[PDB]
Amino acid sequence: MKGDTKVINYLNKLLGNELVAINQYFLHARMFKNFGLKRLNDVEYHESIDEMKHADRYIERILFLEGLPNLQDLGKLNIGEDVEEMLRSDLALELDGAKNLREAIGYADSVHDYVSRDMMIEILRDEEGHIDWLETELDLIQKMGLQNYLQAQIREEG
Amino acid sequence: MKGDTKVINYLNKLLGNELVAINQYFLHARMFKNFGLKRLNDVEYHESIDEMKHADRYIERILFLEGLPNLQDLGKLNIGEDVEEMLRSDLALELDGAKNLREAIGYADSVHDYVSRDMMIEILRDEEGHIDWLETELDLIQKMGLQNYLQAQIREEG
Amino acid sequence: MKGDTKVINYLNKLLGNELVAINQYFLHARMFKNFGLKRLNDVEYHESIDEMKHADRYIERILFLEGLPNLQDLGKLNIGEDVEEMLRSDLALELDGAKNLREAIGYADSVHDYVSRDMMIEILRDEEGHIDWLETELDLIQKMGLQNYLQAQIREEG
Amino acid sequence: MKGDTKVINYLNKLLGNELVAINQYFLHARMFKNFGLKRLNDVEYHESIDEMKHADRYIERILFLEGLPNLQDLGKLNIGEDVEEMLRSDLALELDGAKNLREAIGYADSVHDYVSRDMMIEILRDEEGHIDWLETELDLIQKMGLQNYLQAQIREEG
Amino acid sequence: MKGDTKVINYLNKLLGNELVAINQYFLHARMFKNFGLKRLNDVEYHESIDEMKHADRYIERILFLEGLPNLQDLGKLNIGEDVEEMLRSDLALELDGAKNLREAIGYADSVHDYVSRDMMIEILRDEEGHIDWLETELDLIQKMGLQNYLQAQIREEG
Amino acid sequence: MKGDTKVINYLNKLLGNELVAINQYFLHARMFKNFGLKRLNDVEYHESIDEMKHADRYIERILFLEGLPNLQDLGKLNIGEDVEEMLRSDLALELDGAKNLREAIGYADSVHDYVSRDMMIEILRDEEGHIDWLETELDLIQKMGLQNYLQAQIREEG
Amino acid sequence: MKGDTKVINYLNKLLGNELVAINQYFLHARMFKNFGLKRLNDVEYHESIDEMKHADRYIERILFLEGLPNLQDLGKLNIGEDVEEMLRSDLALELDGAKNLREAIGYADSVHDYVSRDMMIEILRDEEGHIDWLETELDLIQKMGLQNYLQAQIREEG
Ligand code: HEM
Ligand code: HEM
Ligand code: HEM
Ligand SMILES: [Fe+3]
Ligand SMILES: [Fe+3]
Ligand SMILES: [Fe+3]
Ligand SMILES: [Fe+3]
Ligand SMILES: [Fe+3]
Ligand SMILES: [Fe+3]
Ligand SMILES: [Fe+3]
């Protein structure tokens, strides 16, 4: 079914965001794993998978609407060296992505692509989940201090 | 994540509605139970639980959006003395709540708080369910008469 | 069965206490949950449920004794902003409620409402349990320090 | 263990009440059964059993306290001919028994027979249950009318 | 079905016997239990239940035949203070009851109430069982002596 | 929670009783075991455990009420040399303990420590159980004679 | 079998030690429990049980050897107010008991009471276990600091 061109550009832009997040989250995960912060590796890994699911959804939708998924261009990764910096970087990324999502959802509505919208609202809900988790972790770091925070990531959560 | 202030006020207003419904429905439930109308106790009870789930959702959302859930102010309960009056009171309440929900949903959309909107649409769908049930019961009372209606509430539905 | 009027007023006053505790405990629970203090969310939540059970018992008893349960008036919630302040607030509330209970129990005895008394003694025993738990948590905070206390609430207890 | 004499007289008086209720409830049960009111036979039967449990408890307690259980004297049965009259008769009996119980409980307390008291408070709680049930049935008869009430007792409750 | 009047009087007289036996056997049972004669408590208890079954059968039959079951008049209990005396008292009672049964059975036959007769013959067979048991126990007491007999009742029979 | 001082003294006095009973009952148990009176070892042992449960309850309660459990002072053990003397000694002890309990319960009531009272009433009920058992055994010894009584304690009760 | 008198005195002295440890360990356990140090309550409790097993063994042995177990005299409890002080007190007690055990074992050997010796060597092995555990805990307190040590006792070990 031929989709609205501008919806497809939004879908490709959002796909672009997911591609960045996939990599940044996966690297972060294995950095944590190397640091021995087993718990942060598990969560960040499961979030990389999450962004993969999102990418897949965009790709299928773009194809359905007869556009060309763009997996060629990769935006800026911001990696960082310590736990806080890395978490904070994931949060900034997630916030920029939520912004683009809000914009795309409004536009899809106005051209009546309600199923693209519906898909995007689900993804946004997932993003808001990641945002919640990140914000909480970052406050925990301040409230309990870095040393206690680190000790608390050593073992995986059952 | 800092939410839109006016969305938070709506969420607190809706939360306010749920708080009223929770109490009015619970009292009604146990009044029915005391009357020996076992079936009406079961349904109204399960609806009190339902409104609790709604309150919980608002509270979590307000907190997520960094507002202050207001559980302090309690609107007017209207209790009533006989079955019809009590059912009718629940229906009026549910109708005022649906009105506030319609208004909040429109507003959340226009400030792009799509996940608050999504949550609110689910809740509205639940409210419309309660409305359906209440309307039906009230017509049954007219069509079959109060005495038969009452006899029909004595045993619980399997 | 027509109960003693003053017993009913006591039951409504106690019900009043439970209504306050239900809300204060539920809000606290979800505040903790938002803070990421998973363990405190679980305990405070299970205490909100507890106070609900108490409210239900009063409501049923008032109805049985042919009084009018009052779910309309809601006393002062005191919420607070940090863990200690919130725990301490729950403790003060629980202490005022235990005071009213002691008074109601003595009175029910003197008008021979022994089953209302029996119910109230069970509830008091539950309250004393909450008091024990709160006092212990607050001392733990002093003995081990806030930072260690917080780290210790991150994971739920199996 | 030698008990207080007056406690034993109370226990025998209460036992006396149970003996009456046992018979009146059993006869009523089988009258209902004969009437084809299967549901009322089940409940009244289960209440006759209940009063038997009470009698047994008094008998064991009297023996323990070294008194002589009196199963020889039987108070006035009031049987009645139709459903309402019979239910109403059970209610009056249950009310006189609750009165004697309230009095015995106060006295046991003042001579420090706390375990006799504890037993009596449990029994009173059971009586208050029977009272609740009876009152409810009698109101149902008025609210839904005798004909509908009767139809509603034909089948047993699962 | 309207029964023969005199059959109904017999059924009420027999019912009267059962009512006496029910109480005398139950008291004896719990006296034994208090004495620590666990085995005699079990047997006498199971015989009280037995007489209850008999009473129930009479009550249902009287109602069926459209008479008025009489649970108001209670014949003489003879309780006794020691094991032998109490067993012997149960035996005398059981013997008087068998006498009335023999008489009632003959009469029911002559007015053709064969199903009342059939019921009564079953009950008589049960009574003869109790008689057998009682006689045996009483001879055991003589043959082995009271002290050995008592020791032999301490534990329940598997 | 700061308790009433005099309640705490009562709780320590009662705890004192349990401490005595624990030891006297345990020694008696193993004396019986040595005598080969397997059945008396089982019962007395299970009663020593029982008094331990009581001690534990007092200790926890005293601590809760912020007093100092006193396990230092041990009252007079009275051991005795033969079965009767030892049983009789347990009975006297149990009787003195019931006396102190009756007194403590009355006092707890008058200062409104209803949960301490509730706990104490449960314990009293247990004590009254031990008293019943002891009295029965001692009468069995008289009724069946010492030799038969002893033979009857050789095997354990299933 | 008549034992050596001096062995019996040793057994009574060792029994004396166990009696002290039983109480001191049980109180400590419930103090920890009250402090909310769930893990220390579990271990100290399981050590109180352990000392009970030891007492039982001495009591049975003394009886077997035809001496009089002495449960009347209770040595000095040293309770203490904070965790370290209490642990340290248990360690000193355990050390004095090991000393008496070493002495008793040597003596039992020289009078050829090899089975008393064998029993005592097993108990000593258990004591050495408690000593190991206590020493380790006390060093952990120094190495990780009191605050971290406390946090680490909050949850029970699976
Ligand atoms: C104020 C009067 C209220 C009464 C009398 C009441 C009563 C009850 C009762 C009896 C239960 C069942 C206990 C159980 O789950 O085992 C329950 C469950 C629950 N309540 Fe309330 N409640 C009240 C208010 C509230 C409020 C203000 C909230 C806040 C959101 C709330 C949230 C919940 C939740 C989430 C459940 C569990 C539902 C489930 O998973 O089945 N309740 N309530
Ligand atoms: C006097 C008229 C009575 C009638 C017609 C009657 C009838 C019955 C019947 C039909 C049963 C069921 C049989 C079964 O358990 O399988 C029963 C049970 C029982 N009865 Fe009676 N009864 C009478 C009086 C009494 C009295 C005076 C006592 C003395 C306490 C008593 C004590 C009991 C007890 C303890 C049970 C067993 C309850 C259970 O565990 O389910 N009954 N009765
Ligand atoms: C002082 C002489 C005592 C002796 C000889 C003794 C003996 C025993 C024995 C042999 C057991 C069974 C072990 C097991 O549970 O597997 C036991 C259990 C127990 N003891 Fe003691 N004990 C004594 C004092 C105490 C004291 C002072 C307390 C303090 C409250 C206490 C509290 C307990 C408790 C709570 C149990 C577990 C009961 C159960 O759950 O079955 N004991 N005791
Ligand atoms: Fe994504
Ligand atoms: Fe709702
Ligand atoms: Fe409460
Ligand atoms: Fe009763
Ligand atoms: Fe019979
Ligand atoms: Fe005790
Ligand atoms: Fe030891």
Curated annotation (Swiss-Prot), chains A, B, C, D, E, F, G:
Catalytic activity of the protein = 4 Fe(2+) + O2 + 4 H(+) = 4 Fe(3+) + 2 H2O; Fe(2+)(in) = Fe(2+)(out)
Q: Cofactor stoichiometry and binding?
A: Binds 1 heme b (iron(II)-protoporphyrin IX) group per dimer. Binds 2 iron ions per subunit. The catalytic dinuclear iron-binding site within each subunit is known as the ferroxidase center. In BFR, the ferroxidase center appears to function as a true di-iron catalytic cofactor, rather than as a pore for the transfer of iron into the central cavity, as found for eukaryotic ferritins.
> Can you give the residue ranges of the Ferritin-like diiron domain?
1-145
Under the subunit heading, UniProt states:
Homooligomer of 24 subunits, arranged as 12 dimers, that are packed together to form an approximately spherical molecule with a central cavity, in which large amounts of iron can be deposited as a ferric-oxy-hydroxide mineral core.
User: What UniProt keywords are attached to this protein's entry?
Assistant: Heme, Iron, Iron storage, Metal-binding, Oxidoreductase
Highest taxon in the source lineage: Bacteria
**Similarity comment:** Belongs to the bacterioferritin family.
Consequence of substituting residue 31 to H/L: No loss of heme binding
The residues that hold heme b are 52
Q: Which residues bind Fe cation 1?
A: 18, 51, 54, 127
What the protein does comes down to: Iron-storage protein, whose ferroxidase center binds Fe(2+), oxidizes it using dioxygen to Fe(3+), and participates in the subsequent Fe(3+) oxide mineral core formation within the central cavity of the BFR protein shell. The mineralized iron core can contain as many as 2700 iron atoms/24-meric molecule.
Activity regulation text: Iron oxidation is inhibited by Zn(2+), which binds at the ferroxidase center with a higher affinity that Fe(2+). The occupation of the ferroxidase center by Zn(2+) also severely restricts the ability of BFR to form an iron core.
Effect noted on mutating residue 130 to E: Decreased Fe(2+) oxidation activity. Is also severely restricted in its ability to lay down an iron core
Instruction: List other remarks.
Output: The internal surface iron site that binds iron 3 is important for the mineralization phase but not for Fe(2+) binding and oxidation at the ferroxidase center.
Q: What's the source species' lineage?
A: Bacteria, Pseudomonadati, Pseudomonadota, Gammaproteobacteria, Enterobacterales
This protein's name: Bacterioferritin
